[PDB]
Every structure is written in structure tokens, then in C-alpha cells.
Amino acid sequence: EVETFAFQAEIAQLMSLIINTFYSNKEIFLRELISNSSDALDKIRYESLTDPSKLDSGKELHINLIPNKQDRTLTIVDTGIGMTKADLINNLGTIAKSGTKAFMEALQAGADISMIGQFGVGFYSAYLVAEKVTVITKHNDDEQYAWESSAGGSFTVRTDTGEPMGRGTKVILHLKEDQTEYLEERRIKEIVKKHSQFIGYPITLFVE
Ligand SMILES: CSc1nc(C)nc(N)n1
Numbered sequence: 001e002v003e004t005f006a007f008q009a010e011i012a013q014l015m016s017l018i019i020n021t022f023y024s025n026k027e028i029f030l031r032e033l034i035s036n037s038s039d040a041l042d043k044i045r046y047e048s049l050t051d052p053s054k055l056d057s058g059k060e061l062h063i064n065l066i067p068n069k070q071d072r073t074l075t076i077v078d079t080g081i082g083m084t085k086a087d088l089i090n091n092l093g094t095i096a097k098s099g100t101k102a103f104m105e106a107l108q109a110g111a112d113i114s115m116i117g118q119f120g121v122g123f124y125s126a127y128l129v130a131e132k133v134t135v136i137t138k139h140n141d142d143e144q145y146a147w148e149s150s151a152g153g154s155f156t157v158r159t160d161t162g163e164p165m166g167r168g169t170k171v172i173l174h175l176k177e178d179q180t181e182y183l184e185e186r187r188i189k190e191i192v193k194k195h196s197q198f199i200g201y202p203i204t205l206f207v208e
């Protein structure tokens with residue numbers, strides 16, 4: 001039922017660097033995730049422009065932010081295009097090998113971790129705040145899958161039989177014990193307003 005894969009070496013190295021480097025401006029992970037969701041919502045809107053049935057699995061294009069203090073999770077949900085099993089395994093549909101290469105040269109040459117999103121690997125900035133990340137995804141062309149990784153060089157993929165989602169991606173951040181400020185409503189609102197003010201889809205911050 002559960003398959004375990006090794007990260008490619010460059011992605012393991014990116015993740016160690018993210019986890020191990022001293023770097024205080026951790027809040028940017030949320031901008032990077034919301035941006036990835038905005039990109040996914042753009043793709044499904046674009047397909048729907050020529051085939052409206054692409055939206056049978058859900059017409060509303062939005063992002064929800066759901067903090068849960070009991071489980072210590074921040075979940076970002078979008079109703080974007082979702083990912084196939086193949087996309088999930090291939091670095092969550094990114095060109096993570098070459099983006100990691102360019103990001104790491106950029107760093108050597110004075111860049112900082114906040115510019116990670118310019119290299120196509122902003123997903124992995126989740127590991128600034130999360131000890132484990134769970135991604136549940138559903139693409140129109142495939143079943144619902146759950147990817148998961150606490151870093152250390154491996155990730156799992158299984159068919160997900162949790163709550164169906166229709167279409168899109170849900171990123172569940174199991175936060176590090178010292179990063180629970182990102183479950184506080186005013187902290188989340190501050191970061192969305194600071195870094196995500198011009199995203200073109202409604203962003204709903206759920207209350208507890
Ligand atoms: C990199 S794939 C991805 N990542 C996130 C955070 N959201 C979506 N929709 N896709």
C-alpha cells in the first residue's frame with residue numbers, strides 16, 4: 001500500500017540546507033506555498049478556457065489557510081490543477097534538480113534563502129517550519145494520492161482514501177514545536193498582507 005522513494009541527491013541536499021542553515025526570516029515559506037497554489041489555479045483556469053468540463057470536479061478557484069492548534073498543523077488548500085502520481089514522484093511537478101543547481105550557485109554568490117521561489121523550488125521552504133509535510137493531491141487525470149516526508153532522504157506515496165477533495169492540492173505542515181506562531185490568526189494575516197497581497201484568487205483564513 002505505501003511506496004518509499006529516495007530523494008534525488010540534489011533535493012536531499014536542498015532540504016538539508018533548508019533545515020540546517022541558520023536563517024531567521026522563516027515566514028517566507030507561506031508566501032512560497034500560496035504562490036505555488038496560485039500557479040496551480042492558473043493552470044486549471046487556462047485548461048478550462050477551452051474545455052469547461054475541466055471544472056466539473058469543482059468550479060470555485062480558491063486558497064484556504066487552515067490552522068489547527070490541537071494537531072499543530074497549518075494546512076494550505078487550493079482547488080488548482082492538482083498533481084498526478086507521476087508529478088508527485090517527480091519532485092511535485094518541479095524541475096527541482098536544475099532549480100536546486102541554480103539556487104545553490106545563487107547562494108554561494110550572495111543570494112539568500114528568501115529568493116528560493118525564483119528557482120522553481122519554493123515548495124521545499126516548507127521545511128523552514130515543518131518537521132513533516134503531507135501533500136494530498138487530486139488531478140482530473142488520476143486518483144487521489146498522499147505524499148509525505150520528514151526529510152532525512154526519503155518520501156512516501158500512497159493512494160489516499162481520506163476525505164475526497166474533488167480537485168487540487170492540500171499541503172499539511174506539521175509544524176516544529178518552536179514554530180507555532182504560524183498557527184496564530186494575527187501572525188498569519190500579517191504575512192498574507194505582507195507577501196501575498198496581489199494574489200488573484202480569494203485566500204480565506206479559517207478561524208478555530
Ligand atoms: C510544487 S507543487 C505544489 N505545491 C504547492 C504548495 N501547492 C500546489 N498546488 N502545488
Ligand SMILES: [Mg+2]
Binds near residue numbers: 095096098099
Ligand atoms: Mg531538472
